[PDB]
Design a protein around this ligand. Structure first.
Ligand SMILES: *[C@@H]1O[C@H](CO[C@@H]2O[C@@H](C)[C@@H](O)[C@@H](O)[C@@H]2O)[C@@H](O[C@@H]2O[C@H](CO)[C@@H](O)[C@H](O)[C@H]2NC(C)=O)[C@H](O)[C@H]1NC(C)=O
Ligand SMILES: *[C@@H]1O[C@H](CO[C@@H]2O[C@@H](C)[C@@H](O)[C@@H](O)[C@@H]2O)[C@@H](O[C@@H]2O[C@H](CO)[C@@H](O)[C@H](O)[C@H]2NC(C)=O)[C@H](O)[C@H]1NC(C)=O
Ligand code: H1R
Ligand code: H1R
Lengths: 528, 528
């Protein structure tokens, strides 16, 4: 009985497992229960803490994936399959993982907490690209990840009601963050040095914890990759949340909030999932049915207001985006797009696509978009049109929300570092025209190129090791540098770095001209 | 006596004068009356044809300038004085001038008809810079220019009234064009080949004669320099024309339309001039009080409408702009600007300047202007902001109105040639930051550099000779080219040439991006 694989936490005793990495062994505690299974009558309710247990819980493999739609756009393709669940679906899914050095460290060690993305409708901590064994081995940190409910089960809200309050997925995350504060020390973690980091909806989740005081006490630093809580897809208002919930209920046969939620609780999980995408009000891309709701509780105002009003002195933040944020959403709905051709669209398709990528704005707003992103010397060139639609979708949903957050937090007391990830992985299976798509820096942060079974180049393994060092240096010290430098981002100089095989290169302005349009002008237009 | 300088026209007999140029003599007939003096009860009325006279009218000197405001901005400064009246002011000012080769052509010669600019409030055919003698000698054409009433005398309108119908200054121009049809052959001109050409308000005048059918039979091709009839300053609606005429009356002591115009006719001309600028509704630059009115008569609809609806097959047009259209206007009321320092304005000055240069748009529209003309990587750099504000005023008032006119005329059957004039005159007295300002190409078009009394370089005289050749080629054949090439402007390729000391260089797009904003997007914003 290895005692480096035996830990007791407040609930009971845990048996873990030691994993092999190229560089040595790692202790892994996979599938620790942190909540009572949110099933039956607990479907849609806030998570209740895991009641204590006798004996030893075997924490030796990932537990189930929370119920979620499974992508079938290109069945069998690696590019879509790598994000689909790799454990059975179940509503019993509230488990977290801890990776730690072998042997368990003696000094308290800074802790990285990972929150997966997936548009709040999908994702799991068990995906291969989120394997924490390489970061832990390479940088002597403690790594935690948790599952949280998604789709209807985590974010359906009948706001005001007690049976479907909404935001329960975020409360799953918050409960895991409390587990880390009362139990990470048993693994050698330091509960006073905790860095949240996430990507896409994970990055938006990280942001909502910054802006939610009950969560703000549970961590000290933040990394937001390719996402932000002020993005147009990350939240929904109380009214539109209730409309979507009510339409979901009508669609699956349900009729008073109590009666309605009680009826939903009797539907097979798979039945809800099968109608998830039907409650969306407009034909769209980068829009998800059940996302966090702004109801005055978890978020006391909208993220845009809270960001603008916040005092962030004492916070360090690391934020960034990939080079082609938008391309990957287009093959999911934009007319004329396929992974299987060059997707050289017509001007008529471009205009149709702008309505899909910028859904539910006015006809005037749509015109202002076409103005800014047309080239009026080459208004019909299909290459220019395909890259402009890609930039509309990426700027509107990721780059400009992220840029607004970074600028505000710098101006209001936080230290901010910013990056653009510019390396297209050699093993990438999406077509060349998509550039560096959404989500494909994650494997490099987690060190997956160091996997022997993975066929990466030796330079990519060097690059992976650079990025883990930046991330672990940030988690340890609040600054990705160690004694070319990486300058802080500020609202004036707007400095960021490029991450690729070349050494760090400083640049200025995260698509500044474009983002003036989305963050300054377009709001004013919608207000009149 | 010289039989070459005696001419009989329908009204009677004229005695001209022989004029020296470096290249040989030239016959000039200056101060030919073509209307009954629009005085006393004829003030504000359309011009009557000149009743015949006995004896010989003296046509050897220029005649009176029509009453107009005199610029006092930089008293005694050459840059402002070259445009001020250089003959007495009088309401008895409806005269025109003919320059013709010496001895007079005995076969029919193409005719150029110059309509001078000046905001419809000022101008005169006798300015030194409009001296016909050099074009006539170099390119052997007949040149006519006329005086037309300006300010309230030409364009005060009480729409629907018979006492102040509006647009009589335009009728003055039409009458002179008719005089040319019936009389130009007595000087050797060919009334079947008449080219109109104008600059600034003169170009807008030329464009209004294109869009008005009674004028359209009186000339065959048109040149538009730095002006267009669809510019936001060139026309006014009936409502605002009446408001401006009514407020003028109040400001000079006057009280029914008949009773109002009767009191305005009892006032000395100088009294009307003195209150001219005070009927403007907002603090502004590039905005004039009494301009052509859209009343259904001379303009059956707005010039923007008549353009979009026109069949322009059979029309050749030469249109163009100077390189820094807007800069000159800024020293007449943009905060921070003077000809005597660098005018390095602050952000707050720039934002103030934008409301002055884009007057009477909504706050939302002004915001959109500031979006598109701010460098968000350098939002406070004073040299950048000085350029930006110059470009705002130039694009809003001249470049983009002209680009619209060109693109529609081309796409609706007209053969269009477009130029940018990029030479700064060595003799230019305005500061260097103004670049090539509004109006400072005219002196090259008229061949003034050939005057040895002036300090122009050798290369400038050659440049002047190229320009006079282009213009006169266009006059003779509707094509500026000599038989590098000057390609026609099309709505697709948007090709134009740069005119300076270098050989022609073809370029694409008259500020195509900026003009999509002013010409496509901004109308949609103002109608919602
Ligand atoms: C690029 O492909 C899209 C998508 O078409 C699908 O994928 C192709 C590889 C091929 O297998 C098609 O048969 C598939 O339907 C093309 O857009 C489609 O065009 C078809 C007409 O053939 C039309 O019926 C669909 O509605 C279109 N789909 C979308 C999403 O707009 C597009 O024309 C291709 N571009 C090229 C070839 O340049
Ligand atoms: C550039 O000059 C303007 C205009 O000021 C006038 O011209 C100057 C040459 C000098 O003679 C001034 O005294 C004149 O009034 C400056 O803007 C003015 O600034 C003064 C304050 O000194 C202010 O009272 C006026 O309102 C301003 N006028 C306008 C039209 O805004 C401007 O500051 C100068 N720019 C520099 C020095 O960089
Ligand atoms: C089933 O009908 C739809 C499905 C989707 C959309 C729209 C639909 O109807 C409009 C979308 O727009 C979604 C597109 C993606 F979001 C889905 C998967 N991701 C992969 C990824 C990348 C980074 C991090 C991740 F966790 C996952 C790429 C685009 C799916
Ligand atoms: C008197 O109060 C004003 C006077 C002017 C403005 C605004 C005012 O306050 C509302 C202007 O905007 C005008 C500025 C100019 F238009 C006038 C002088 N010209 C010279 C020129 C150039 C080319 C052809 C010409 F015929 C004349 C350039 C600028 C005067």
């Amino acid at each position: 009985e290895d005692a480096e694989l035996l830990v007791t936490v407040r609930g009971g005793r845990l048996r873990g497992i030691r994993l092999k990495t190229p560089g040595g062994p790692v202790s892994a505690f996979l599938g620790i229960p942190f909540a009572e299974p949110p099933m039956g009558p607990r479907r849609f309710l806030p998570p209740e803490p895991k009641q204590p247990w006798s004996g030893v819980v075997d924490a030796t493999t990932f537990q189930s994936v929370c119920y979620q739609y499974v992508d079938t756009l290109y069945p069998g393709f690696e590019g879509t399959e790598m994000w689909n669940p790799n454990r059975e679906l179940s509503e019993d899914c509230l488990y977290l993982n801890v990776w730690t050095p072998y042997p368990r460290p003696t000094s308290p060690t800074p802790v990285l907490v990972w929150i997966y993305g997936g548009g709040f409708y999908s994702g799991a901590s068990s995906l291969d690209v989120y394997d924490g064994r390489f970061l832990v081995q390479a940088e002597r940190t403690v790594l935690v990840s948790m599952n949280y409910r998604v789709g209807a089960f985590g974010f359906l809200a009948l706001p005001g009601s007690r049976e479907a309050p909404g935001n329960v997925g975020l409360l799953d995350q918050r409960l895991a963050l409390q587990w880390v504060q009362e139990n990470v020390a048993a693994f050698g973690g330091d509960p006073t040095s905790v860095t949240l980091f996430g990507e896409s909806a994970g990055a938006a989740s990280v942001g909502m914890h910054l802006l939610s005081p009950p969560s703000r006490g549970l961590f000290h630093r933040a990394v937001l990759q390719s996402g932000a809580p002020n993005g147009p897809w990350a939240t929904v208002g109380m009214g539109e949340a209730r409309r979507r919930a009510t339409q979901l209920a009508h669609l699956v046969g349900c009729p008073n909030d109590t009666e309605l939620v009680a009826c939903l609780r009797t539907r097979p999980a798979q039945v809800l999932v099968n109608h998830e995408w039907h409650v969306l009000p407009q034909e769209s891309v980068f829009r998800f049915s059940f996302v966090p709701v702004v109801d005055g509780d978890f978020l006391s105002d909208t993220p845009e207001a809270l960001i603008n009003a916040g005092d962030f002195h004492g916070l360090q933040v690391l934020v960034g985006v990939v080079k082609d944020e938008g391309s990957y959403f287009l093959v999911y709905g934009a007319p004329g797009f396929s992974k299987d051709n060059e997707s050289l669209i017509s001007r008529a398709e471009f205009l149709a696509g702008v309505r899909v990528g910028v859904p539910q704005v006015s006809d005037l707003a749509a015109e202002a978009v076409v103005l800014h992103y047309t080239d009026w010397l080459h208004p019909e060139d299909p290459a220019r049109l395909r890259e402009a639609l890609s930039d509309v979708v990426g700027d509107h949903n990721v780059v400009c929300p992220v840029a607004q957050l970074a600028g505000r937090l710098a101006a209001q007391g936080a230290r901010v570092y910013a990056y653009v990830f510019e390396h297209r992985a050699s093993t990438l299976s999406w077509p060349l025209w998509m550039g560096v798509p959404h989500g494909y820096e994650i494997e490099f942060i987690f060190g997956i190129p160091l996997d022997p079974s993975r066929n990466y180049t030796a330079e990519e393994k060097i690059f992976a090791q650079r990025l883990m060092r930046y991330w672990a240096n940030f988690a340890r010290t609040g600054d990705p540098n160690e004694p070319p430098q990486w300058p802080p981002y500020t609202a004036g100089a707007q400095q960021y770095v490029s991450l690729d095989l070349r050494p760090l290169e400083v640049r200025r302005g995260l698509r500044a001209q474009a983002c003036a349009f989305w963050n300054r002008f377009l709001p004013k237009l919608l207000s009149a």
